[PDB]
Design an enzyme around this catalytic site. Structure first.
Site, PDB file in Angstrom:
ATOM      1  N   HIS A  57      81.724  46.122  30.754  1.00  0.00           N
ATOM      2  CA  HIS A  57      81.788  45.273  29.585  1.00  0.00           C
ATOM      3  C   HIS A  57      80.812  45.783  28.515  1.00  0.00           C
ATOM      4  O   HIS A  57      79.912  45.046  28.083  1.00  0.00           O
ATOM      5  CB  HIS A  57      81.534  43.804  29.978  1.00  0.00           C
ATOM      6  N   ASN A  64      92.756  38.481  26.478  1.00  0.00           N
ATOM      7  CA  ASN A  64      91.645  37.804  25.816  1.00  0.00           C
ATOM      8  C   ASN A  64      92.203  37.389  24.462  1.00  0.00           C
ATOM      9  O   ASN A  64      92.534  38.249  23.657  1.00  0.00           O
ATOM     10  CB  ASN A  64      90.461  38.767  25.602  1.00  0.00           C
ATOM     11  N   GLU A 119      89.888  35.477  28.545  1.00  0.00           N
ATOM     12  CA  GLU A 119      88.954  34.851  27.604  1.00  0.00           C
ATOM     13  C   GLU A 119      89.735  34.020  26.583  1.00  0.00           C
ATOM     14  O   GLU A 119      90.760  34.462  26.099  1.00  0.00           O
ATOM     15  CB  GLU A 119      88.145  35.894  26.815  1.00  0.00           C
ATOM     16  N   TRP A 176      86.003  31.289  27.420  1.00  0.00           N
ATOM     17  CA  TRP A 176      84.833  32.025  26.956  1.00  0.00           C
ATOM     18  C   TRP A 176      83.987  31.090  26.110  1.00  0.00           C
ATOM     19  O   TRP A 176      84.446  30.642  25.044  1.00  0.00           O
ATOM     20  CB  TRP A 176      85.218  33.267  26.123  1.00  0.00           C
ATOM     21  N   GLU A 218      75.703  36.828  21.326  1.00  0.00           N
ATOM     22  CA  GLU A 218      77.001  37.185  20.753  1.00  0.00           C
ATOM     23  C   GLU A 218      76.931  38.524  20.000  1.00  0.00           C
ATOM     24  O   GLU A 218      77.153  38.618  18.784  1.00  0.00           O
ATOM     25  CB  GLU A 218      77.580  35.998  19.935  1.00  0.00           C
ATOM     26  N   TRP A 219      76.582  39.574  20.753  1.00  0.00           N
ATOM     27  CA  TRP A 219      76.587  40.960  20.250  1.00  0.00           C
ATOM     28  C   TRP A 219      75.869  41.013  18.901  1.00  0.00           C
ATOM     29  O   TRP A 219      74.746  40.504  18.777  1.00  0.00           O
ATOM     30  CB  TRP A 219      78.012  41.540  20.199  1.00  0.00           C
ATOM     31  N   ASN A 269      86.887  45.709  29.919  1.00  0.00           N
ATOM     32  CA  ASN A 269      87.061  44.539  29.066  1.00  0.00           C
ATOM     33  C   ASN A 269      87.261  44.940  27.609  1.00  0.00           C
ATOM     34  O   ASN A 269      86.477  45.712  27.063  1.00  0.00           O
ATOM     35  CB  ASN A 269      85.820  43.654  29.127  1.00  0.00           C
ATOM     36  N   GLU A 270      88.315  44.421  26.993  1.00  0.00           N
ATOM     37  CA  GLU A 270      88.595  44.664  25.569  1.00  0.00           C
ATOM     38  C   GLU A 270      88.383  46.119  25.132  1.00  0.00           C
ATOM     39  O   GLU A 270      87.531  46.385  24.263  1.00  0.00           O
ATOM     40  CB  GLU A 270      87.721  43.744  24.700  1.00  0.00           C
ATOM     41  N   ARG A 277      84.737  34.553  36.044  1.00  0.00           N
ATOM     42  CA  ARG A 277      84.820  35.936  35.626  1.00  0.00           C
ATOM     43  C   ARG A 277      83.461  36.358  35.075  1.00  0.00           C
ATOM     44  O   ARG A 277      82.944  35.730  34.152  1.00  0.00           O
ATOM     45  CB  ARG A 277      85.886  36.085  34.537  1.00  0.00           C
ATOM     46  N   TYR A 320      91.831  35.021  20.948  1.00  0.00           N
ATOM     47  CA  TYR A 320      90.973  34.244  20.047  1.00  0.00           C
ATOM     48  C   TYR A 320      91.697  33.752  18.774  1.00  0.00           C
ATOM     49  O   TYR A 320      91.516  32.596  18.345  1.00  0.00           O
ATOM     50  CB  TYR A 320      89.780  35.103  19.629  1.00  0.00           C
TER      51      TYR A 320
END
Lengths: 484, 484
Positions: free
Chosen positions: B131, B317, B392, B441, B448-449, B176-177, B85, B319
């Site tokens: 994204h 996704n 993810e 992921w 990481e942003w 995405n998200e 992905r 976490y």
């Protein structure tokens, strides 16, 4: 209808379980202006808006229980009933609604005679303090339950009752069917004082169906909290108990889909939760506030403390159930009645086209004993399983002047209705619900509010053309056998 | 840390089940202004607000996947992965964001080369169209997702993707998200463009944390509905599928009390339901409308028809999870962020003082694999059990600039995390949840942003000081063994 081995027997229930019947003052007493009694909103409604009663009748005479109460007790005793639920007429005790206007001694004496006769016959009194019959003098003065002034007058009334009767009476209910009282007297306006929003069809369409039900409900709950506090402080002693009696419609999701399950939950909140959540936790259900917002008042801090846990038992008045079907929130939908705040429509027919259960006679009581089980499981699992009484359960036979007495006495539909509800009550108690008694509505054919005398709910026939003479119906004969 | 006999084996899952890894364009590609690529909001944010990235870094180079994509495919192949992905950079394809500004043919060639090499290696591409990397030119022109003009430009972008790649790629995800994108880019303002209400701490505190997340969400969903319609009409053919990938936090009632259960449900509605209910039924969850009222836009009739059922599969996704604790509706509480409209606080510690699960490294991912099961049961039982992929799942190792490579490679915490989530996934599939694949992921340590490079999420180590050289970590070697 049930097979013989499925018919309930008395020992299905604990030895301490109570079987009784129930009435209310305006519906049975008559003597509407006798012995110093003041007028209620119901006297005022029937006398001024007789066209708003189906048969243009009133409760001026009713079943004449002010004079015939000894027959009522005799019937209860002969049937082997353990208890009797009745109400006290506020304006019979305080003709002007207030302590200042004076206590009517003859009114006090009547209830004393009745209570004494019950006790001498081994029948436990369960007294409803208020059953919709607000003193008209308080409406004249300040609009009755529309003004917070009602709270002090109601508590003074309750205090008089506790003072006069509390030594002999250990079981009290502050209010009967607050939801019906609010939604139907101030929302749809079918019941006295018959108020609704302009545009809605009722006797007094100069109210507000979106706001007034909540105002009345809020004052009622404030009055409840104060009264329970006074009871606990001065009158409860070692054995007294106080609660209130809630009407609860069973609600079944129109489909087993999340939208209609959500609607069913908003609907339960708007009927049961509106009054139960305040007395259980001190505030209204979240769903009611997020929907109706500023139309829902907030309790003060001290009131709220008094409200939390303000019950020793909860009465459940159960008649019927509906399906609840989701309504979307959109610019196309605007609530008109307080009940529209639930964003749900209450359907008697489900998605397969079938009625939830068969009609029993009148316009609204469909036979659905499972609904009682569903409600008791909610009480048990969600709300802590408090001590409960089924404070009303019953149905009406239509009588438009057409019904010969022998047919009315052969009330097979009512007998089946009672037996099936007792069967479901047994199942619920076996599943752990803390139910401790069952009261049939009603002991007597009586004044069915805006239906007048066109609906006979009694297990005892009242012949109003022959001096209100009483005759047990088939249902009463079965309860007599059942009780032994 | 699981006992040896509890470690998942590949045969726990169906032969047709997909194992893959995931990345996104801004996080791995680099080449931020190479070969005609236009700037995104993320280029703009990192270049103008370095102080708002933990280590003041940017994705100018990232994992250099624009140049090293053949290595990425080699790693996927060596690990035995079935699928990959990845996302396409909008401003790499349309440097001005629009068709009118022209298609960047070097950008198209890049994705064609990656797709070709994936396919040559038997790895199935799952492509995320968007994204979070909005062309900055569209922000300059009209504020990007804050304006309905974004809809036409997005659909034109998606059409270019379908036209260029659709013959080769049969699995598409529009967004995405969306919840994180809306709430965190426009509500808390942590992510580009970094907008929030005045008084909230973010880079651009001249937005509106109450209204902007809903506006962006509504435009995104309108774009989604239109894009799926175009896909179905012109590109789907016999084997194509399109959906979207939703972040879902697990939510556990703070207590098993009705108030906190209701709060849990509001919280699920505000995260999962916000985007899932529109694509499933054509509108936002009731709880979201009744709470946020006029701040929630309404879909037009024609859009709504396209929105209903606008998915062939749903990406999840997953976490972490929190507890959800009720907040009362009162004059004392006034929402500040869109997430406050849920009337629920998200607590990492429960009523017994315990964290929901242990920290995994960073500030927010607590280990709670059971939350994945709760979410999958909800998808199965409430929302019809659509085809699902875990698009993810993963966690980060902290690297404050010093992390020894040999230590970074021995990622025991990640391996345990992956094994435990795979075990819960197996339980969910055995219980009937229609999950068809799992994507770790991330394939690569990446940008990481707003944490920059301080969090390494890869199963593959990326050495940025040594030409972004890649080395499999322990977690990757395990996956390699697992996939055989």
């Amino acid at each position: 209808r049930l097979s013989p081995w499925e018919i309930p027997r008395r020992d299905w229930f604990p030895p301490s379980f109570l079987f009784g019947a129930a009435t209310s003052a305006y519906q049975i007493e008559g003597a509407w202006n006798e012995d110093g009694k003041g007028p209620s909103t119901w006297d005022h409604f029937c006398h001024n808006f007789p066209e708003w009663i189906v048969d243009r009748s009133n409760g001026d005479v009713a079943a004449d229980s002010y004079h015939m109460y000894a027959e009522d007790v005799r019937l209860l005793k002969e049937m082997g009933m353990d208890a009797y639920r009745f109400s006290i007429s506020w304006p019979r005790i305080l003709p002007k609604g207030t302590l200042a206007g004076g206590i009517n001694e003859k009114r006090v004496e009547y209830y004393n005679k009745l209570i004494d006769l019950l006790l001498e016959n081994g029948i436990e009194p369960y007294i409803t303090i208020f059953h919709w019959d607000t003193p008209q003098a308080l409406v004249d003065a300040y609009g009755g339950f529309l003004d917070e002034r009602i709270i002090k007058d109601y508590t003074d009334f309750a205090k008089v009752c506790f003072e006069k009767f509390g030594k002999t009476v250990k079981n009290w209910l502050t209010f009967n069917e607050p939801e019906t009282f609010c939604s139907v007297s101030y929302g749809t306006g079918v019941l006295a004082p018959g108020r609704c929003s302009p545009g809605v069809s009722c006797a007094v369409p100069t109210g507000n169906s979106l706001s007034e039900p909540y105002i009345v409900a809020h004052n009622l709950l404030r009055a409840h909290a104060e009264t329970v506090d006074i009871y606990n402080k001065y009158h409860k002693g070692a054995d007294g108990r106080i609660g209130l009696a809630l009407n609860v419609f069973g609600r079944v999701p129109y489909t087993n889909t999340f939208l209609d399950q959500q609607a069913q939950e908003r609907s339960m909140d708007k009927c049961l939760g509106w009054f139960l959540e305040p007395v259980v936790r001190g505030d209204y259900p979240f769903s009611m506030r997020v929907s109706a917002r500023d139309r829902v008042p907030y309790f003060k801090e001290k009131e709220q403390e008094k409200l939390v846990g303000s019950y020793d038992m909860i009465g459940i008045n159960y008649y019927t159930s509906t399906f609840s079907k989701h309504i979307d929130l959109s610019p196309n939908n605007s609530p008109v009645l307080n009940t529209d705040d639930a964003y749900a429509s209450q359907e008697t027919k489900g998605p397969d086209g079938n009625a939830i259960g068969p009609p029993t006679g009148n316009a609204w009581i469909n036979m659905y004993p499972k609904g009682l089980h569903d409600i008791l499981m909610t009480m048990k699992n969600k709300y802590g399983n408090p001590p409960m009484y089924i404070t009303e359960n019953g149905m009406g036979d239509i009588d438009k002047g057409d019904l010969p007495k022998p047919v009315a006495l052969e009330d097979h539909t009512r007998l089946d209705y009672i037996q099936r509800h007792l069967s479901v009550l047994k199942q619920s108690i076996d599943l752990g619900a803390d139910v401790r008694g069952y009261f049939a509505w009603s002991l007597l054919d009586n004044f069915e509010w805006s239906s007048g005398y066109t609906e006979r709910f009694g297990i005892v026939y009242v012949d109003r053309e022959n001096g209100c003479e009483r005759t047990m119906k088939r249902s009463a004969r079965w309860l007599q056998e059942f009780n032994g």
